Paper text:
A recent groundbreaking study discovered the ancient origins of the cGAS-[name] pathway in bacteria, which play a similar role in the immune system to combat bacteriophage infections. Binding of cGG to bacterial [name] causes it to oligomerize into long filaments and activates the nicotinamide adenine dinucleotide (NAD)+ cleavage activity of its fused N-terminal Toll/interleukin-1 receptor (TIR) domain. Depletion of the electron carrier NAD+ eventually leads to bacterial growth arrest or cell death, restricting the replication of invading phages in infected bacteria, a strategy called “abortive infection. In this study, we demonstrated two distinct mechanisms underlying the regulation of bacterial STINGs and a structural basis for cAA recognition and oligomerization.
The crystal structures of bacterial [name] from [name] (RiSTING) in its ligand-free and cGG-bound form were determined to 2.1-Å and 1.46-Å resolution, respectively. Despite the conserved D252 interacting with the N2 atom of the guanine base as previously reported, the bound cGG is sandwiched between the guanidinium group of R235 and aromatic ring of F171 (hereafter “sandwich binding”), in contrast to the four-layer stack interaction with cGG by Prevotella corporis [name] (PcSTING)21. Alignment of the anti-parallel RiSTING dimer with the cGG-bound V-shaped RiSTING dimer revealed a rigid-body rotation of a whole protomer (~70°) plus a dramatic conformational change in the α3 helix (~120°). Despite similar linear filament formation, RiSTING filament is much more flexible than PcSTING/MySTING filament due to smaller dimerization interface and devoid of electrostatic interactions.
Residue numbers in the entry:
A (entry chain A), B (entry chain A): 4 to 162
Amino acid sequence: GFPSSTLAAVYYENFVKPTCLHIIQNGGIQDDDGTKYENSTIKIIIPQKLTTDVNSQFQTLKKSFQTKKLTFDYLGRPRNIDVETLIQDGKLYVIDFPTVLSGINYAISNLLPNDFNSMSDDYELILNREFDRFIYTLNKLALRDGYNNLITVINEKDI
Amino acid sequence: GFPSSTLAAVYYENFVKPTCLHIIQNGGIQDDDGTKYENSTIKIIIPQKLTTDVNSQFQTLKKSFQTKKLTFDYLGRPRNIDVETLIQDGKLYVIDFPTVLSGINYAISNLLPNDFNSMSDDYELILNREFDRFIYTLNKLALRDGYNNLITVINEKDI
Ligand SMILES: Nc1nc2c(ncn2[C@@H]2O[C@@H]3COP(=O)(O)O[C@H]4[C@@H](O)[C@H](n5cnc6c(=O)[nH]c(N)nc65)O[C@@H]4COP(=O)(O)O[C@H]3[C@H]2O)c(=O)[nH]1
Ligand SMILES: [Ca+2]
Ligand SMILES: [Ca+2]
């Protein structure tokens, strides 16, 4: 249907779902010191602006949240899973800025005059519609699988 | 625009492009024994059928091509890059079955009667249209950046 929905579907199937299954099946995510955090949950961060350099955007968010990388395998997966994590008060949070959101910039290209400015109300509307579709798809798939209470999706503007 | 185009754009920006830049900037990909292969190129494999278990599909293709995993960092990237590789006659091939293609199944859901069979001519047409858009987008972006000669995109049916 909409590109933003399909990007949420691959992000869910190939990242969020196996992360949730690891949390459930492993009894949590393990830190460097060997502590396993049964109470592991996921915060998915939607940025206020979407840049054409999501790698630098990721780095700036990692610095701001003071996260560190942990890694785990999910059986059958082609590659390991890497997560940015914060540990507070006996709880672990995966804090993910999805690199898949770069696809939204590709989509929107055709929807704007190509003299467009990123700060305009028109542009804020079109981007927010794509984010709304992405968020709904992510939540729909998580709810269907029973992982609603493991995942929250937060817009940067609302922090 | 089309979901399949947007999936190609994220696959290109967040995987194919940094792989190409590593090959160019590093003077190739390095094997376990320390041999660096200046002649490193990418074969992107489009499957004949798209399953709802791309992880098992990836494993079956890895077994058939007899590839092994190599890993490298690309400066600024949130995570390392993992590639399946084959080495033959002084040349290295990245052989990638893109897990992003799972998104095409999500897209197509609405386009078929939901009593549909995967083997029908109708279904072969709709899937092939999505693959055609994915391939064109990948090639367009690679050509724009100058990486056309590093990448070939092969349909499994044509091997
Ligand atoms: N934090 C975290 N997020 C993850 C991880 N794996 C997947 N994701 C997230 O899930 C999205 C979809 O991944 P995909 O469908 O496998 O689709 C992927 C996959 O086909 C390919 N790709 C990305 N990284 C690699 C890699 O290291 N090796 C290979 N062979 N392909 C990769 O590029 C596509 C697009 O990737 P993105 O735009 O980055 O979009 C990714 C990213 O936002 C992970 O280990 N950690
Ligand atoms: Ca939730
Ligand atoms: Ca080519």
